[PDB]
């Protein structure tokens, strides 16, 4: 049978239909709720709908399952958009890729995972992109400092992992970091037997972040193409709308 290039895609285009694809963890009874919204300003009111954190000072735990796969002998790409529309003080904006053994109804901050990737902000001192590989019972952190975006607009985050043990990180479809797994972490290191769930495990103080346009693919050129069709289409119209609102607030 024909092998797919896309393992997972989520754009939230079918209204409340997303609730059949994403599971809320019940690990705690006080997790915050994600709501479907395109927010105060956006590129397109319908296309720019995504998952938005709705409660301040709260832990979040929501995840989506997909047909399990292995990245052995292939490239792996994880990509999504993050929009901290609230002008965030402190909060996570990263994803985790888990093996199929994860119980989605029990997912939490300390559940075992394979890879963690994305922006984390906590005051001026923490504006970073995490790139964590689980290896031989340790969650190994990248030894390179990658600065994340901190404004109110939609930004595209991309992690590419290749079978030659090389990686690349992109922000807004432009390279920000690259190198070898052997050099940039203190460890087939690239390869995982099973990926089955993508999860949002976050802590936020000022809530309101919107997540959209998730993609997991073995095709790095396609991730760039989809990036331009999503974040690339949102960008200019979103900036025009916020500039217009700031002009209304000014007066
Ligand atoms: Ca969307």
Residue numbers in the entry: 16 to 202, 304 to 367
The authors write:
shown to play a key role in the MHC class I assembly pathway. cellular processes with broad patho-physiological implications. GSG linker and the C-terminal residues 369–417 were deleted. The long C-terminal α3 helix is kinked at Thr346.
to two different crystal forms in our study. yielded similar structures, except for their N-terminal extension.
